[PDB]
Amino acid sequence: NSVPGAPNRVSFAKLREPLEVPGLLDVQTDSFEWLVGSDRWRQAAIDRGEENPVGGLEEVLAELSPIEDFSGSMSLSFSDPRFDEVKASVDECKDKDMTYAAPLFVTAEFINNNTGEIKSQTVFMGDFPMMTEKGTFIINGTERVVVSQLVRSPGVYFDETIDKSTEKTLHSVKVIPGRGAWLEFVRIDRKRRQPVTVLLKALGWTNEQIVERFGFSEIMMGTLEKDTTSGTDEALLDIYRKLRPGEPPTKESAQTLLENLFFKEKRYDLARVGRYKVNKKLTLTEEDVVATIEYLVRLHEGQTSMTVPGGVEVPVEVDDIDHFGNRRLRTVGELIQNQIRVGLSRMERVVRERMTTQDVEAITPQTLINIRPVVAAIKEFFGTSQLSQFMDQNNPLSGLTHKRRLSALGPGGLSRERAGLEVRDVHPSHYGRMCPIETPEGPNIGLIGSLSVYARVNPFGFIETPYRKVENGVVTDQIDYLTADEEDRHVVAQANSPTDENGRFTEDRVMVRKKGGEVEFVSADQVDYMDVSPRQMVSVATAMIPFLEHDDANRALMGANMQRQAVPLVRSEAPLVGTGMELRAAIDAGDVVVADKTGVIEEVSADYITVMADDGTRQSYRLRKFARSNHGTCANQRPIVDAGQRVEAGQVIADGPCTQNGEMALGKNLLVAIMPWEGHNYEDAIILSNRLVEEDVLTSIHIEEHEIDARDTKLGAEEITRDIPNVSDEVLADLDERGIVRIGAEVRDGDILVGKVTPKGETELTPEERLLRAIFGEKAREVRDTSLKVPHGESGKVIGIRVFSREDDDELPAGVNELVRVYVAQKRKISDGDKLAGRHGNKGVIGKILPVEDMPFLPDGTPVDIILNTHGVPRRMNIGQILETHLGWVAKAGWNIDVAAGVPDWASKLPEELYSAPADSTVATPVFDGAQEGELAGLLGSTLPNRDGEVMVDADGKSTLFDGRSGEPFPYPVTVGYMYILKLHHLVDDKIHARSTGPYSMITQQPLGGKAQFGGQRFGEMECWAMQAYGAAYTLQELLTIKSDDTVGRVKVYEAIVKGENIPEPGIPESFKVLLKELQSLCLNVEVLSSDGAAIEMR
Amino acid sequence: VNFFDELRIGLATADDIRNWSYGEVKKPETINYRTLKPEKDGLFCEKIFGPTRDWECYCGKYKRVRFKGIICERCGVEVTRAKVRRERMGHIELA
Amino acid sequence: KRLKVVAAFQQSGNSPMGMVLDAVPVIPPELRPMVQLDGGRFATSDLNDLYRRVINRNNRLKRLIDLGAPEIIVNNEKRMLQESVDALFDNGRRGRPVTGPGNRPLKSLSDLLKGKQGRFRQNLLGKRVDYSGRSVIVVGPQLKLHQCGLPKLMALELFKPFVMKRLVDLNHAQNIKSAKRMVERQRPQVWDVLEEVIAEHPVLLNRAPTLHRLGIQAFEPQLVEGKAIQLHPLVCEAFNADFDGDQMAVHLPLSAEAQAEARILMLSSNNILSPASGKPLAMPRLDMVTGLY
Amino acid sequence: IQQYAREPISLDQTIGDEGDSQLGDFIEDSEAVVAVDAVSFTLLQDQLQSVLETLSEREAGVVRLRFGLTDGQPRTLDEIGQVYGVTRERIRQIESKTMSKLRHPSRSQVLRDYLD
Amino acid sequence: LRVQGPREVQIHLVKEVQEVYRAQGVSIHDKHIEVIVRQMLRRVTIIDSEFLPGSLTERAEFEAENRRVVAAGRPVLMGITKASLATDSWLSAASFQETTRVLTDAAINCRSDKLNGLKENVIIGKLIPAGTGISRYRNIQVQPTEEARAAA
Amino acid sequence: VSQDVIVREHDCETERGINVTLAERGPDIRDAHVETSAFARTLATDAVDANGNVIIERGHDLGDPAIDALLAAGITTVKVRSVLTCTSATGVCAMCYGRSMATGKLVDIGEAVGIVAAQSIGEPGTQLTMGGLPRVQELFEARVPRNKAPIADVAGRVRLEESDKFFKITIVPDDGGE
DNA sequence: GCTTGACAAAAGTGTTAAATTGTGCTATACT
C-alpha cells in the first residue's frame, strides 16, 4: 500500500494505519552514521536537538585530547578525523576476501611547553570498516552483522530483600558506573565489614554534620555512635588497609586513594547515561554520595518523597533492573566506539612513555604514535567478537531479522548461565519495543529478542515506541515517540477503539494501560496517548503469521523461528493468504532491486536492468545471479519489468530470492487434506503429491565452495597440476591442463576437483612395493598426492572457478603461491525426509510421496498435494492453520457475496468492496485486525466454477475425496483447501551419515565425529547405561574397544571380516592407557597388578 | 592381557619419577625454527622420548629394522617404532 | 579429623615425603603434541608452555645459585618455580590462572581429567565408534515390528567390509582392491550382494536422549529407497520419537555374541512392556486408537 | 622471514562457538594404520610369494636378495654373486632375464591391480 | 531413623518418593524405589574402634571384622551422592565427581581397586560383571550330542 | 549409586519381609495402589485366612487372581519379600526382587536391577512439574526437609496449646513417664 | 653357461669455505 508497484492484495483490516512502518534497517544505520557522524546525521541533530553534534569518533577523540605527561612539559592534541573514499567495492571485496573499509586520517599536534614549538603531522590511523546499504559489513570477504546488546544503564538502583535471620526488611543499594570500582551499601570493591558512616569521615566531615544531615534517620545516628573510628584521617586508614592489604600507607597515598578511585575522572568514568540517570533521580564528587545515603534512609523509613539541601523532590522507591527504563541497548555505533577507546588507551600508554626515553624535540606525532593497538581493536572486534556475527541469510527474512536482533549476552553483560530466569520473563514495558513472541526455543529463551515493528532507538540507548496522543476524548494526528520511563507516566488507550467521525472517543469507556502495568477504564476523558496501531508489540517475522491472534504463543514462537529457516525456491511463489508485512519487509531486506528515480526502462537483460530517468540521468542495476549465500542458499534475482515500462521512485525492478512482485514468498501454496491417510502421515509426518517433484514446485538450488591452496613447503613448492602420482587416465578425464575441473562438468563423491601435488621426503619404499615398480616399470614418483576431491555424499555441477596465482600478481599470504576456488551447485528436488512447515508452528518431515494417480482427489479429478494428520492439530492450540486453509481455498476459487436485497448481516461491520474477488486473487489479514470468524463462514459458500459450474467445497470447508487406490469415495466429508507451507533448511542429503572405517583422532585413537571428518557416532554415558540395563556385555565391550579405541583390535576385526574368519578378542582401550600416563604425570603411581603377579606393563 | 586383578595408586616418590624417566629434559625448546625437527635435550628430544620415524635415528646412520633396540652412537636415539614416543616419560631435576 | 590423614600414612608404606617433589615427571610428547595444520601453520598443547615456564625458572634458579645471590633474588625465584609447577598441575587452583593470548587460561594436567570434556566422561565412559550412522526418520507403517527401513546408501557403507568379501568370493571382483573400488563407485552389481549380507543380520537403533534401556532396540534391516530411515510406528513410544524431524543412530553388531545379544536381549518384538510399570508400551496409540474405537 | 615470525596456536582452543568441541580433537592421525591397506598389502605379499614359485630356485633367490624381500635389506649385484659364487655381471644378466619373465603377462596380469 | 529404626526409614522414604510420582500420574513399582533406598542404609557409623570413630563403614564389612574371634556403631542414613562417593572403587568414584578430591585421598590411603564393579570394567574394556558377563554364563561350554553327531 | 546391584542368586532364604496393606475396612475396597506395591511381589510367609485356611502359600507370584482370591478370604495385610530385607551376601536374590516387569516372570539371574531402577525413576522426571523434582532430590539426598515437621517421640495422649505465632504440643506418655 | 676389462654413474669421504648460531657489550642520569 502506497508503494508505486505494490501488487493488489485485499485486506480485512477495519482500522487505518496512521503511521507507515518505519524503515526496519534504521537501527543498524543511524548507529553507524552517528559513529562516523556524516552530514546525513549532522542535519538530524541540528534541525531539532543539540547544537553541537559530536560524532562517535570525535567524542572518543575529545577524551584523548590532549596528551600530557606528569611533567606536563609536552602535550599532543588530536582533532579533525577524516575518511577517504572506500578502497574497493563490496562486490570486489567479497570476491577478493578483503574487508570493506575507508582509510582514516587525523590531526596530531605535538607541543613542547619549554620550547613552545608545534609539530603538525597528518596521521594515518588505519582502514576503518564501513557499513553497507544493507546495514552489514564485509570482514575478510564474508558479510557480517553486529548485533545490539542489552545492558543495565549506569545509575543508582536500590532493592529490598527480606532476611530470613531477622525475618525483617533490609535495603541494599548499588551504583554501577561506566568504569571503575563499584560500591554497595559499606561494601566497596568486594571488601565487606564496612561502616558506611566511617567513609563520610574519610572525606573529613565532622560528626556534627552527621547529626545535622542525618536528621530523622535513627540508624544514621546509632551507627556513628557504634563506630570506634575517631578522626577523618584515621577512618581513611581503616578504609586503606582493607582496600590495599599488604601496603603500608602514607598521608599522601591515603587521601588521594579515595579521590583517585572515584572523584578522579581517569579511573572513575562519568557515563553520559549514568550522569543523566542519577542527576534527575537525585561527575561524582560528594553531592552524589551523600544523596544516595539520604535516598536509602528514606526508603527504609517508608517516605515516598525525599528532599535535601539544594535539590529537587523525587519519589523514594525501589527500582526494577528489568524495566526498560533502566535497561538500555548498545547499538553498533557504540559497540564500535567502545572498542576504539580501548585501542587509544593502549596507544596513550605508548605515547606517554615514548616521550620519556625518546630524544626531546626529535619526537613527532608519527614517532610518539603507534597504531598497532588501535587497528588491532577494530580487527579483533569484527572477528572473534560475539556481537559481530556471520550474517544469517537463508532468505531475505532470515537476514533482515538478524539485524534488529537485541541480546543480553556478550562482553559487558551477564553471560550465559549467570543470568537469572527473572530477566527472561517478559516485562510490561516490552510492549511495542521488544517482541515477546519471537525468541529462541533453547537455553537462550528470553535473552535474545527482535526489535518491534515501530520501535525506535534513542541517542542514549533506550528504545522508544510511537504513540498518538489523545486530548479530551479526541485522538490527534500528533505522534510522539516515548521512552519506557515517560510511558508509565501516562495512560495508553488501545489501538482499536470505536472512531467517531472527524474523530473522538465513541465508546462509553476506553481500554487503558497503567504503570503497573494495570488495565482499567475511564469515560475517555482521562486518556492521554493511544496506540499507533495493532501489532506494536509484534516483530516483523511475528507480524507475518496470518491469524496470529488464534495461535498460542508456544506454537507462534515456533512459527516465527521457522520462517527464518526457510529456503529460496526456484519458482518463489508468494503467499495466497498473507498479512500486511509481506511486501514492506521484502524491500527493506535489501535482497530486492528498487528504483531510486522515476523514469523508463532502456534495457532489460538477465545480466542488468537500465532505467532512463525523467532527470535525463541514467541508473543501472547489475542482477545477482546464482550467488551462493552464506549458508548455501541461492541468491538469484529476476527482472519483473519489461522494456517500455514506466516506473516510479521506490518501485520493484526485480525479485529477490524469496520475493515475488515485491512481497516475501517463503513457500508455496498447496492443496491440503486434513484426513489421516493409511498411517503414512502419523505423529507429524506428511505425504506429498509426486506432482511437487515433476513440476519443481518445492525444488531449490544449493551451492558449495571448495578451496585448495599451493604453498611453499620446506621440501619444495606445492604445484597445482594435472599429473597425479598413481591414477587412471580416466579419473583425469574432466580435468583441464592446469589440473582443475572443467566448468560445466558433473562431480561425484570422491571425484577430483583441483589436482595438487606436494614434495616428498626420503621414501624408503617397501620391498614388495619396489619389486612391482621394476616389473611394470612405473618409476616411483618424487611427490605425494594431496588433491582436492569432492566431499563424501555430495554431488552437483561445476558452476564457476576462481584462481588466484602468485605468478599473476594478485595477493596471497606469505608462502601461498596459488589459490583456486571451485563452486558446485545442485538442484534439490523435494524428497522424503525433508522438513516442511507452515507459519503457525506446525512442522513435519515428508513421510511419503505418492503418484498423482493414487491420491485423495476432489470430484474434479484434482489430486490434493499434501495430506496432514488430524490428531496433532487440536491439541497443539494452533488453529490458524485450519483458518488459512479455508481462506486459502477462498482466495483460490474466488467468490461473490450476495447482492440480492442488501448486504448479509455477517458483512455489517465488514469488508469494504471485498464483496467480490476473481479466482486466484491474493488476500491479506493483518494479525490483530484481520478477518473474523463470521466473515469466514459467509465466504465459505462462494463462486463455483472449476470449469463446469459445480461447487468443489461446501460452507464447512469440506469435500468428498476419492481414494486413488481403491477408487471409492471416502465415507465422510474431508476438509480441503490451500495452505502456505515453507521448505526448511534441514535436508536429508546433508543429515545422512554413515561410517565403517575412517580417520582417527591423534592423541586419542577414537574416530573423530562430524561429517567433515567422515566420523562415527558417539556412544555415550546414557547409551552405555541402556546397554548395561539389557545385560549385554559383549555388545558393550565391542563398542568401546574394537570399534573405537583398540589400535590393534580394529585392524584385526577388519582383517577378520574380509577373510570371513571369527572376530578376534578385544584389546586394551588406548584411551585407558593414556589415563595411566596422565595420572603418572601428576606424581600418582598407578600400577596395574595381576592376581598374584604384582606389576604389569603396557607396551 | 586384558585381565588384571587390582589397580592401585600411591604417592609417587622422586625416585619412582626418576625410574620412569628415560632422561632429563634440560631445555625449554620444542623444535628448530628452520628444519622443524625436535631440538635435542628439549621437550620432544628424540634422544629421550623416542624416534619420530619408525626404526630411524635422528641422524639416520641406522635406518633399518635389521637392528632393533640399538642406540646410535652419534645422535643417541634408539631404533624402534615411534609408538614409544607416546609411551615414554621424561623428568626435570629441580634445584 | 587430623588423625584420619596421620593414620592413613601409618598403614601404607608411603613416605609422607612424597608430598614434596625433588623431580617433576614430563608427559610423553604425543600426549602434548605439536603439529602443523593444513596450510603450514602450527598448533600445540598448552602443557608445553607450562612445561616451558617451569624448566625456564628452574634453570634460571641454578644460574642464580651458582653466582651466589642475595636471598631476596633467590627466594623470589623459588617462589616463582613453586607457582610454575602449581600451574602445570592445577592451573588457577591458587590465584589467577596462567593465561595465553586473548586472556584465556591454559589447560593444566588436571584440566584433562575433570569435567564433561575430561577423559572419563568424554573419552572413557563414552566415545565415538566405527560402523555407525544416522539420518532423519520416516514412518514405517508397513513394517513388521522387528524390521526397520535402512537407506541403501547408508547400509552399503555400514556393511562395506562384508560386501567386499562376498563380491570377492563370487567372481564379481578378482582382488580386494577391485572389490573396494567396486563398492566406492557403486557398480550396480553390489546391490544384489548387499541384500545377502544384510539378511538376518540385526542392527541397533538409538535415539537420544536415552532415558530407559528401551531407547536402544534391535531390528532386522530392510534396504529402503531414499536417504531417510523407516521406523515402525509402534516403537515411537519407547523412543519418544516425533517425526517432526528427529534423527536416529544405527550401530552394527559384529561379533557372534554381539549379534546374539541383539536378536535375543534387545530385539524389538521381545521388549513390549516397559520395565518400570510392566504396562504395555508398543500398545497402539493416536490414529490406531481412534481407528479401532 | 615472514614465515619464521608466525607463531603457533593452541590445540586446546574452543573454536566450536556453540560447537562444544576443541580444535585438538579435529586433528587426524596420518600415521594411523589403515585396515584395508594392511590387509591388501598382506594379500599382495602372498601373491608375490606365489609368482616367485614359478621362477627358478636361483631366479627367485636372486630376486629376493636383490630387493631384500626376506631380510628387508636389499643387496648389491656383487653381494648376490658372492652367495651364488659368480661375478656381479652374471647376476646382472640373471636379473634382466627373470624380470622379462615376470613381465610375461601370465605372471604380471594378477599383480596389475596392486599399482596403488 | 533414630526413633523408629532402620527398617522403618526405608518404608518412609519409599512412601514419600512414591507420593511425588503419584501426584504427577507416574506408575513406578515400589521395588525400583526400594533398590535405591537400600543403598542409603548400607553403612553404619563407628563410635569406637581397626576402625576409627565417625567413619562410615559397610554394614557387612563391619560385622565380620568387629567380631574378630575373642567397636559399636549405629545405622546411618546418607544421600545417594555421599553414598556413591564412598564406593570401594577409587576410579569409579573418580569418574563420578570431585575427581581431584577423590584422587588425593586415594593416593594417600594407597587404595587398591579390585575391578569388581561394572563401571570399572567399562573403563578398562573388560566384560561387565552382569548379564552375559557373569561367570556362569560366559563359561558355558557347548558341544553337540553324541546322538546328533551320529545323524550328521 | 545403584549400578553395582545385580541378582546374584536364586534365593537368600531369609524369612524377613515387609507388610503391604492391600485393602482397608471395606465394604462396611482394594488399596488405591496395590499394583505398584502388592503385585509383582512374592509372599514371605503363608497368608492365613481367619482361623487356619492359608489361602496362599509363601513364595507365590501374587498376580491379579491371587489378589482377588486373597481379598475374598478377607486379609487386610500381607508380608512380602523385598530387596530391603534381602540377606544376599553380594547383590540380591531373584526371589526377594520378584517378577521382571519386562518379562512378566521371575527375574533372571544376570539382570542388573540397579540401573533399571535408576532409569525407571529418572525417565518420568521430565514429567514432574518443577512437590516435584526438588522434593524427590530432597528425599534421595537425605537432606533435612525444607520445612521440618516433628514426629511423636513416644505413645500417649496429646495436649495442644496455642501461643499466637506458635503452637505447643505435649505428649502425656502412657507409662506414664516424663 | 660364465668371466674379463673398459667405463661411467652413483655413493662415500675428507677438506674448505660459507652460513648460521651464541655471547659479550654499550659509562649524563634514570630506583
Ligand SMILES: C/C(=C\[C@H](C)CCCCC(=O)O)[C@@H]1O[C@@H]2C=C[C@@H]1OC(=O)\C=C/C=C\C=C\[C@H]1O[C@@H]3C[C@H]1O[C@@H](/C=C/C[C@H]1O[C@H](C[C@H](O)[C@H]1C)[C@@H](O)[C@@H](O)/C=C/CC/C=C/C2)[C@@H]3C
Ligand atoms: C549464542 C550466541 C550466538 C550463537 C552463535 C547463535 C545464537 C544461537 C541461538 C539460536 O539460534 O537459537 C550469542 O550471540 C551474541 C553474544 C553471545 C552469544 O554467543 C555465544 O554464546 C556463541 C557464539 C557467538 C558469535 C559467533 C560468531 C561466529 O560463530 C559462527 C560464525 C560467526 O557468526 C555466527 C553466526 C550466527 C548467526 C546465527 O543467527 C541465527 C541463526 C543461527 O543460529 C545462526 C545463523 C538467526 O536466527 C539470528 O536471527 C540469531 C542471532 C543470535 C542473536 C544473539 C546475540 C548475542 C557462526 C556460528
Ligand SMILES: [Zn+2]
Ligand atoms: Zn643416529
Ligand SMILES: [Zn+2]
Ligand atoms: Zn533375598
